[PDB]
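User
New here, help please:
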Amino acid sequence: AAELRMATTTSTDNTGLLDVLAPAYKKDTGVDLKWVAVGTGNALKLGENCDVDVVFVHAPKVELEYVEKGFGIDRTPVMYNDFVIIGNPSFKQKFTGMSVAEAFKLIEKEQVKFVSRGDKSGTHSKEREVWKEALGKIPEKESWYIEAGQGMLATINIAEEQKGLTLTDRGTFIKYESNHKGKPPMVIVLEGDNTLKNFYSIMAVNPKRCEKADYKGAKQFIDWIVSEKMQAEIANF
């Protein structure tokens, strides 16, 4: 009967993360998670306006703005659905033992085809971050660096078509895999590096501006997530 009201993002909702957390939380705590999944800006606006108790999003840029502006507090990452580098089976041997930075340097050196989302995407700005960390620059103008301007799944097909590489979240690759049953066009070629980790952030609505937000409920949920049992539990999804 007790509940906690959450504004989240349509892409976050689609990962199923929340559908995993909610039953587990109800079991430990007796509280029902209730969420609405909208646009990023609107998810934050819902917290800004005192419509929810907590906010759950996937965009570190604005998350930080948000905290700054005074809208959210207790920013708390939940790691999930890590990014991986994929390409045809040829490539796996190529990078064995390597960090992402070492592999990307190699990609540049040998000029292997790399396909970027090249759209307004969470995956795209992440992938840009990875090149920046690896080379100190985004190879935007290199002949081998192609910007598709397409959804994740379309840019995987382009990478496959041009016998090159791309960066995708694990969830989509799983979907891609269920499509091409049998013998794989595409295969995980690099994973695990810390810079490839994926985080979704929970923030509590600031009680100082939202007198009637259930900040208690918010802090309880956040503490639960942050707790070792759930830290260890989450890592094992």
Remarks:
- The beta strands are 3-9, 32-38, 54-57, 72-79, 83-87, 114-116, 145-147, 165-169, 187-190, 199-205.
- The CA atoms of residues 88 and 186 lie 5 Å apart.
